[PDB]
Ligand binder design. Structure first.
Ligand SMILES: CC(=O)Nc1nnc(S(N)(=O)=O)s1
Ligand SMILES: CC(=O)Nc1nnc(S(N)(=O)=O)s1
Ligand SMILES: [Zn+2]
Ligand SMILES: [Zn+2]
Lengths: 204, 204
């Protein structure tokens, strides 16, 4: 009801809110935006975030052709995952992006699951292992957040974003581009209960 | 630049765009949306589309908390990829999504890249192999359209979307959920030069 679509929504329902979209841009910006999207893309930023339906890059309200997006569970950058590492290769080599964002978010069930032992099944257990490694690397800290669980999940969330950062900093194309200074990289948290973005201090 | 941001944009410019984004949803919907998001997420759709800066789910004009998203290069579903297969497991088994969408698009360079004889390099060459294997699998058809490559790409991008759809139906959860009729799956194309979506027939 409050959301724009519903599970009962018919195919044409979806296409209607698409017809809107098209209409909305053609009013605020005319045909210029779509003439450029058809010619080519020159995005200034690549977004690496979690697949959560609330933490999408929509939180930056951008026109198409501006943000290169990659989204998976728990916004993890695994060096041994050809999906992410391949995106980085293209974002830097060909498009020459000028800013890379990796964004976790509050209420990331992928984090709350990592703090649990209850096996999940299928690939998720293995896919979430890189965060479990953080849970162990920083328990001496995390154990203190016992009676305050919400703060526990937030801290591990930030650490996961920090880990995903250092992982992307070690990518050859990213490493070669930083030392030259032609790229910036930021870490951020999307607060799901407020819509605001918070930058994360990144250690060296 | 008619775009909202610019490659020279500072960090402060990104926050303002976010602050804006927050203002719109509150103005038009109050604190309601971010109060629901703050509690949890119950999206109705799984979006699996290319990562292109122009083919993002924003072409549905949806609010946060509606679309569980995953995006990679060329919108490919390979049963040997942890990230994607893990998203499919979570979307159907837990979130109990009602409809899934696989969306290629036009001018998808990953398709055009698979239409050249030279290698790309890095980890990208072997990420695109599923597409190249489809170009080979259907050259009887790709043997036409050589008159105009634009039409050829439109067909391969199509075929790629299709293939990704059946591979998705091969997921255990997906196979189980579809047989029970507890879920739908659609295949679409996002025409980048006009912003309209186009449904694609998906055979058996
Ligand atoms: C097993 C697992 O990953 N659990 C999930 N819970 N929430 C998720 S989210 N915020 O990435 O959509 S994933
Ligand atoms: C040129 C190449 O190697 N492929 C890419 N071209 N477009 C891509 S996109 N639209 O999926 O981001 S990837
Ligand atoms: Zn998450
Ligand atoms: Zn593409």
């Amino acid at each position: 009801f409050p959301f724009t679509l519903s599970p009962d929504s018919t195919i044409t329902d979806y296409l209607n809110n698409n017809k809107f979209y098209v209409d909305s841009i053609k009013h605020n910006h005319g045909d210029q935006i779509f003439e450029l999207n058809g010619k080519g893309q020159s995005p200034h930023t690549l977004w690496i975030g979690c697949s959560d339906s609330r933490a999408g890059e929509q939180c930056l309200a951008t026109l198409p052709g501006e943000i290169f997006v990659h989204r998976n569970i728990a916004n993890i950058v695994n060096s041994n995952d050809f999906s992410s590492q391949g995106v980085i290769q293209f974002a830097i080599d060909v498009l020459k992006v000028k800013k890379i964002i990796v964004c976790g978010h509050t209420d990331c069930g992928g984090i709350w699951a990592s703090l649990s032992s209850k096996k999940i099944g299928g690939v998720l257990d293995l896919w979430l292992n890189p965060v479990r490694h953080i849970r162990a690397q920083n328990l001496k800290l995390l154990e203190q957040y016992n009676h305050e669980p919400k703060l526990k999940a937030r801290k591990l969330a930030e650490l996961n974003v920090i880990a995903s950062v250092i992982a992307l900093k070690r990518h050859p194309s990213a490493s070669t581009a930083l030392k030259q200074g032609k790229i910036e990289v930021w870490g951020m948290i999307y607060d799901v209960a407020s819509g605001y973005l918070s930058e994360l201090e990144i250690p060296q």
